Enzyme design. Structure first.
Site, short mmCIF file in Angstrom:
data_model
loop_
_atom_site.label_atom_id
_atom_site.label_comp_id
_atom_site.label_asym_id
_atom_site.label_seq_id
_atom_site.Cartn_x
_atom_site.Cartn_y
_atom_site.Cartn_z
CG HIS A 46 -0.63 0.52 2.61
ND1 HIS A 46 -0.12 -0.15 3.61
CD2 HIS A 46 -0.77 1.83 3.07
CE1 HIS A 46 0.05 0.63 4.62
NE2 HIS A 46 -0.34 1.83 4.32
CG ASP A 97 -0.25 -3.65 3.16
OD1 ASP A 97 0.04 -3.14 2.09
OD2 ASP A 97 -0.38 -3.06 4.22
N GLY A 196 2.15 6.68 9.26
CA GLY A 196 3.58 7.05 9.08
C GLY A 196 4.43 5.85 9.44
CB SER A 198 2.51 2.07 6.41
OG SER A 198 1.24 2.40 6.98
N1 LIG Z 1 -3.11 2.46 13.91
C1 LIG Z 1 -2.24 1.74 13.23
N2 LIG Z 1 -1.76 0.64 13.73
C2 LIG Z 1 -1.79 2.16 11.97
C3 LIG Z 1 -0.55 1.68 11.43
C4 LIG Z 1 -0.07 2.09 10.17
C5 LIG Z 1 -0.85 2.97 9.50
N3 LIG Z 1 -0.69 3.51 8.34
C6 LIG Z 1 -1.73 4.26 8.15
C7 LIG Z 1 -1.88 5.04 7.00
C8 LIG Z 1 -2.91 5.98 6.92
C9 LIG Z 1 -3.09 6.77 5.79
C10 LIG Z 1 -2.23 6.63 4.72
C11 LIG Z 1 -1.18 5.71 4.74
C12 LIG Z 1 -0.35 5.61 3.64
C13 LIG Z 1 1.04 5.56 3.76
C14 LIG Z 1 1.86 5.48 2.63
C15 LIG Z 1 1.30 5.46 1.36
C16 LIG Z 1 -0.08 5.51 1.23
C17 LIG Z 1 -0.89 5.59 2.35
C18 LIG Z 1 -1.02 4.92 5.89
O1 LIG Z 1 0.04 4.02 5.89
N4 LIG Z 1 -2.63 4.27 9.13
C19 LIG Z 1 -2.03 3.43 9.97
C20 LIG Z 1 -2.54 3.07 11.19
#
Ligand SMILES: N=C(N)c1ccc2[nH]c(-c3cccc(-c4ccccc4)c3O)nc2c1
Lengths: 246, 8
Positions: A46, A97, A196, A198
């Site tokens: 993603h 993912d 942030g 991810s």
């Molecule tokens: N609560 C959590 N455990 C969590 C962890 C990772 C996440 N990553 C995200 C996320 C939200 C919006 C956009 C992206 C994203 C990051 C990079 C590219 C595209 C979308 C996210 O990874 N929400 C997240 C929430």
């Protein structure tokens, strides 16, 4: 990360920071990842889905800060970007993912071993820690769900693995969580991963090694009650990985 | 003196 401590890369020498370049002059952070071998980094599909142009991504190893430099850091270009076929997202979850990036340096080399750059170990076929296990997650993600900026220093926190049974409960995530995902939370819903983070690792020990057990993937909110963080279950993708890292 | 996955 919500909670956690601030660290340096000497404490997560396998963590990689991926940024994207823009025309205009900026490079913005994308996602975290980990180093499996000299030339391969693993992250989350993603992170690259909306803009799969490998030439616009930069991967940095040996980095404790987000926008300033660390002495020892290595910069790389993405040579091969491999996203997962059968990657799908719904209103929350992302399925399959995991993604692979093959890194090449401007001199034609892959990572080299220092005190700030190390590989993390893979798990063995479908082998996981038992629920209860404390694992640590790391990254440059939000500190509060309300923030609109990321920290400049690397953070880290410890979370425990929970079972599917507890996660698929109706008042948690129901059936959004499948057998190829893992859930992790803080007993007192105080720390967690967040936007942030991810692509970053979930590391736990397995049979003596520090193993990449999960990749930060999704979650509802950050550090919310009965809303664990969900991670890709790496032990269940080893075939896939192997097919590309041969 | 070479990678050792998992070691800090
Ligand atoms: N609560 C959590 N455990 C969590 C962890 C990772 C996440 N990553 C995200 C996320 C939200 C919006 C956009 C992206 C994203 C990051 C990079 C590219 C595209 C979308 C996210 O990874 N929400 C997240 C929430």
């Amino acid at each position: 990360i919500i909670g956690g401590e601030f660290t340096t890369i000497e404490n997560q020498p396998w963590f990689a920071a991926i940024y994207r370049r823009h025309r205009g002059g900026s490079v913005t952070y994308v996602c975290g990842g980990s180093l499996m071998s000299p030339c391969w980094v693993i992250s989350a599909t993603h992170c690259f889905i909306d803009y799969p142009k490998k030439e616009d991504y930069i991967v940095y190893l040996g980095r404790s800060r987000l926008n300033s430099n660390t002495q020892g850091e290595m910069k790389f270009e993405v040579e091969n970007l491999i996203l997962h076929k059968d990657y799908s997202a719904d209103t929350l979850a992302h399925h399959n993912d995991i993604a692979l990036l093959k890194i090449r340096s401007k001199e034609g080399r892959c990572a080299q071993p220092s005190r700030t750059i190390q590989t993390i170990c893979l798990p063995s076929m479908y082998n996981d820690p038992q629920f209860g296990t404390s694992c640590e997650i790391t990254g440059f993600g939000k500190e509060a769900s309300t923030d609109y900026l990321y920290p400049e220093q690397l953070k880290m926190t410890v979370v425990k693995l929970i079972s599917h049974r507890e996660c698929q409960q109706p008042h948690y995530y129901g059936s959004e969580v499948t057998t190829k995902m893992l859930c992790a939370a803080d007993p007192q819903w105080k720390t967690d991963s967040c936007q942030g983070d991810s692509g970053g690792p979930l590391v736990c020990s397995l049979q003596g090694r520090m193993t990449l057990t999960g990749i930060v993937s999704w979650g509802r909110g950050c550090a919310l009650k009965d809303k664990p963080g969900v991670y890709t279950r790496v032990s269940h993708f080893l075939p896939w990985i192997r097919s590309h890292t041969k | 003196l070479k990678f050792q996955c998992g070691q800090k």
